[PDB]
Design an enzyme around this catalytic site. Structure first.
Site, mmCIF file in Angstrom:
data_model
loop_
_atom_site.group_PDB
_atom_site.id
_atom_site.type_symbol
_atom_site.label_atom_id
_atom_site.label_comp_id
_atom_site.label_asym_id
_atom_site.label_seq_id
_atom_site.Cartn_x
_atom_site.Cartn_y
_atom_site.Cartn_z
ATOM 1 N N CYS A 74 -9.242 1.534 7.423
ATOM 2 C CA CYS A 74 -7.826 1.165 7.601
ATOM 3 C C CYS A 74 -7.336 1.524 9.009
ATOM 4 O O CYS A 74 -7.350 2.734 9.365
ATOM 5 C CB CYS A 74 -6.967 1.921 6.608
ATOM 6 S SG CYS A 74 -5.236 1.436 6.722
ATOM 7 N N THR B 26 0.838 -1.229 0.000
ATOM 8 C CA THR B 26 0.000 0.000 0.000
ATOM 9 C C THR B 26 0.858 1.258 0.000
ATOM 10 O O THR B 26 0.842 2.005 -1.001
ATOM 11 C CB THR B 26 -1.003 0.003 1.154
ATOM 12 O OG1 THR B 26 -0.343 -0.038 2.408
ATOM 13 C CG2 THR B 26 -1.892 -1.213 1.073
ATOM 14 N N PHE C 261 -9.125 4.904 2.398
ATOM 15 C CA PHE C 261 -8.862 4.073 3.604
ATOM 16 C C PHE C 261 -10.121 3.286 3.985
ATOM 17 O O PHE C 261 -10.181 2.770 5.113
ATOM 18 C CB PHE C 261 -8.326 4.920 4.762
ATOM 19 C CG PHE C 261 -6.946 5.454 4.491
ATOM 20 C CD1 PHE C 261 -5.828 4.639 4.482
ATOM 21 C CD2 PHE C 261 -6.807 6.776 4.099
ATOM 22 C CE1 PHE C 261 -4.588 5.157 4.152
ATOM 23 C CE2 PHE C 261 -5.572 7.294 3.762
ATOM 24 C CZ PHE C 261 -4.447 6.495 3.822
HETATM 25 C C1 HEM Z 1 -1.485 4.227 1.918
HETATM 26 C C2 HEM Z 1 -1.505 3.113 2.662
HETATM 27 C C3 HEM Z 1 -2.743 2.328 2.846
HETATM 28 C C4 HEM Z 1 -3.971 2.293 2.221
HETATM 29 C C5 HEM Z 1 -4.441 2.967 0.961
HETATM 30 C C6 HEM Z 1 -4.787 1.362 2.959
HETATM 31 C C7 HEM Z 1 -6.104 1.069 2.609
HETATM 32 C C8 HEM Z 1 -6.968 0.265 3.326
HETATM 33 C C9 HEM Z 1 -8.328 0.020 3.000
HETATM 34 C C10 HEM Z 1 -9.060 0.562 1.802
HETATM 35 C C11 HEM Z 1 -8.839 -0.779 3.964
HETATM 36 C C12 HEM Z 1 -10.261 -1.287 4.008
HETATM 37 C C13 HEM Z 1 -10.316 -2.708 3.459
HETATM 38 C C14 HEM Z 1 -11.716 -3.272 3.306
HETATM 39 O O1 HEM Z 1 -12.758 -2.638 3.631
HETATM 40 O O2 HEM Z 1 -11.793 -4.441 2.803
HETATM 41 C C15 HEM Z 1 -7.776 -1.050 4.885
HETATM 42 C C16 HEM Z 1 -7.874 -1.847 6.003
HETATM 43 C C17 HEM Z 1 -6.768 -2.158 6.797
HETATM 44 N N1 HEM Z 1 -5.502 -1.709 6.690
HETATM 45 FE FE1 HEM Z 1 -4.831 -0.402 5.443
HETATM 46 N N2 HEM Z 1 -4.113 0.911 3.996
HETATM 47 C C18 HEM Z 1 -2.902 1.426 4.024
HETATM 48 C C19 HEM Z 1 -1.860 1.189 4.936
HETATM 49 C C20 HEM Z 1 -1.883 0.273 5.963
HETATM 50 C C21 HEM Z 1 -0.866 0.030 6.889
HETATM 51 C C22 HEM Z 1 0.514 0.724 6.929
HETATM 52 C C23 HEM Z 1 -1.364 -0.912 7.774
HETATM 53 C C24 HEM Z 1 -0.717 -1.538 8.922
HETATM 54 C C25 HEM Z 1 0.537 -1.329 9.259
HETATM 55 C C26 HEM Z 1 -2.674 -1.255 7.363
HETATM 56 C C27 HEM Z 1 -3.471 -2.132 7.992
HETATM 57 C C28 HEM Z 1 -4.813 -2.312 7.668
HETATM 58 C C29 HEM Z 1 -5.648 -3.237 8.435
HETATM 59 C C30 HEM Z 1 -5.188 -4.084 9.591
HETATM 60 C C31 HEM Z 1 -6.883 -3.150 7.904
HETATM 61 C C32 HEM Z 1 -8.144 -3.865 8.347
HETATM 62 C C33 HEM Z 1 -8.815 -3.008 9.435
HETATM 63 C C34 HEM Z 1 -10.039 -3.683 10.073
HETATM 64 O O3 HEM Z 1 -10.960 -4.065 9.307
HETATM 65 O O4 HEM Z 1 -10.149 -3.797 11.341
HETATM 66 N N3 HEM Z 1 -2.970 -0.474 6.296
HETATM 67 N N4 HEM Z 1 -6.627 -0.396 4.483
#
Ligand code: HEM
Ligand SMILES: O=C(CCCCC1CCCCC1)N[C@@H](Cc1ccccc1)C(=O)O
Ligand SMILES: CN[C@@H]1CCc2ccccc21
Length: 454
Positions: free
Chosen positions: A399, A267, A392
């Site tokens: 996220c 990401t 996000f």
């Molecule tokens: C620019 C960087 C990033 C973008 C665009 C991004 C985007 C997203 C998106 C769109 C989701 C929602 C997924 C869904 O609804 O199916 C998500 C969930 C998540 N992201 Fe990110 N993310 C980024 C960086 C990170 C980083 C650095 C971490 C951890 C170190 C991370 C951990 C997570 C986790 C654990 C979830 C699930 C949250 C939950 O449902 O409880 N993400 N992310």
């Protein structure tokens, strides 16, 4: 009440062959441009509806009506990410338990503790570029991926992948990339029990084993040593969910660490790559961002407080997320029978996909200049309507890493603009590679040092 448009069919395979491509998200974007704010997509035994308009996505984002769905992609990634936060259902006990334990580790306040570790890797990037010879260029997504993977290894569990010491990824990363590739390729296998794929199945099991053994060994090694570090692993070994009163068990900790490593690799590296792409294609924007970096980052080591002052660098990142949201989709299910947009009746359990690049091109929200890179659209965050901008995701399933990703990307882009001028020496034509995420493949630049000491 309206019939939903549907793209062209292929007899009994219905719409499935439209996604037999290495660029399925871009294929769905072209379908959305042709069919509009909603279309139905059918495959044998499956129906999804793709949403593109803020008018419909704002309803889909009502958590009283819709919850996070695991897309078939996320179901395939769950074979190694398990019931970590990203691949768990909202109703699984481990979702709310991990969410409650981990939220404080991911807060804006917690970024103060991760800052020094982020600086360590960012300074490694700047030194790499300072050390290139005159006749050399930068492989942008390659270096940004070395950076964001290393940052999450260090902040995640005090492990150095040492990606700037290597041509060939750490073996963990080899297995992780190949498992991610197998998950996404399986979406396109009209019949996956053909013995032709027995080799894919065997390789997939061997890659899962590589990933479990490094991560289970790291958890085991940390419990044995008793060491207390400022990393996510210490927070997960010590933390207790206030609701259940329980800590995460070791297997679930392993799924979280795998999930975080997937995020760091896939990401933030994409965001930084798109951001640098848009800066070299828009030199007025590059000058304004470089002016801010020069004025704000007055010390050889940036501080947490200085990163917070890089407002225009933050607007550049948001505008790059607007045009190319590196995580380009999320999936929802209807909790009950409901009508979407007064026009589209859904049944309980019906699946929606949100096409985030299309949401971000809704001319009724952004105006007719929607394809132009203009960080100034974000100068006044208040002016962005609710549910117009969703890089996000949404609500309690948004996220958890958002503050982490933006802190790292702002710090790194800030340091890049402080230390170098950049040249688009090939006049690079954007070519977007798809995994779980979007990245600009083959994007190369030349940097000219401003000769400012670290
Ligand atoms: C620019 C960087 C990033 C973008 C665009 C991004 C985007 C997203 C998106 C769109 C989701 C929602 C997924 C869904 O609804 O199916 C998500 C969930 C998540 N992201 Fe990110 N993310 C980024 C960086 C990170 C980083 C650095 C971490 C951890 C170190 C991370 C951990 C997570 C986790 C654990 C979830 C699930 C949250 C939950 O449902 O409880 N993400 N992310
Ligand atoms: O819309 C897509 C293809 C783009 C996913 C992009 C998505 C993958 C997760 C991380 C963010 C980006 N997949 C749906 C529908 C589907 C199901 C089976 C076969 C073919 C399509 C799904 O995975 O449920
Ligand atoms: N951030 C989440 C967590 C890992 C990942 C992979 C692709 C898309 C979104 C995500």
């Amino acid at each position: 009440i309206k019939e939903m448009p549907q793209p062209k069919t292929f007899g009994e395979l219905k719409n499935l062959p439209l996604l037999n491509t290495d660029k399925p998200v871009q294929a769905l974007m072209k379908i959305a441009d042709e069919l509009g704010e909603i279309f139905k997509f059918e495959a044998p035994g499956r129906v999804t509806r793709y949403l593109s308009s803020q008018r419909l996505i704002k309803e889909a984002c009502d958590e009283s009506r819709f919850d996070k769905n695991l897309s078939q992609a996320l179901k395939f990634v769950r074979d190694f990410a398990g019931d970590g936060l990203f691949t768990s259902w909202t109703h699984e006990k481990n979702w709310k338990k991990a969410h409650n334990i981990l939220l404080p580790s991911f807060s804006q306040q917690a970024m103060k503790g991760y800052h020094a570790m982020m600086v360590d890797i960012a300074v490694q990037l700047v030194q790499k570029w300072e050390r290139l010879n005159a006749d050399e260029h930068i492989e942008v997504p390659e270096d940004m991926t070395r950076l964001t993977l290393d940052t999450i290894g260090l902040c995640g569990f005090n492990y150095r992948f040492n990606s700037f010491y290597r041509d060939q990824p750490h073996p963990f990363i080899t297995s992780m990339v190949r498992a991610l590739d197998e998950a996404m390729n399986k979406l396109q296998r009209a019949n996956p029990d053909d013995p032709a794929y027995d080799e894919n199945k065997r390789q997939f099991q061997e890659d899962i084993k590589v990933m479990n053994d490094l991560v289970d060994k790291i958890i085991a090694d940390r419990k044995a040593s008793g060491e207390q570090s400022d990393d996510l692993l210490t927070h997960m070994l010590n933390g207790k969910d206030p609701e259940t009163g329980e800590p995460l068990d070791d297997e679930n900790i392993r799924y979280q660490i795998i999930t975080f490593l997937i995020a760091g690799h896939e990401t933030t590296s994409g965001l930084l790559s798109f951001a640098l792409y848009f800066l070299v294609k828009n030199p007025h924007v590059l000058q304004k961002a470089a002016e801010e970096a020069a004025r704000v980052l007055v010390d050889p080591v940036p501080s947490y407080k200085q990163v917070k002052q890089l407002k225009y660098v933050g607007m550049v990142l948001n505008e790059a997320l607007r045009l190319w949201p590196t995580a380009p989709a999320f999936s929802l299910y209807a909790k009950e029978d409901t009508v979407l947009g007064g026009e589209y009746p859904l049944e309980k359990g019906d699946e929606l996909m949100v096409l985030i690049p299309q949401l971000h091109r809704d001319k009724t929200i952004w105006g007719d200049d929607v394809e132009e890179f203009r960080p100034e659209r974000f100068e006044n965050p208040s002016a962005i309507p609710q549910h117009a901008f969703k890089p996000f995701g949404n609500g309690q399933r948004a996220c958890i890493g958002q503050q982490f990703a933006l802190h790292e990307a702002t710090l790194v882009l800030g340091m890049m603009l402080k230390h170098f001028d950049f040249e688009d020496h090939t006049n690079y034509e954007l070519d977007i590679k798809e995994t779980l995420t979007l990245k600009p493949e083959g994007f190369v630049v030349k940097a000219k040092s401003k000769k400012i000491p670290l």
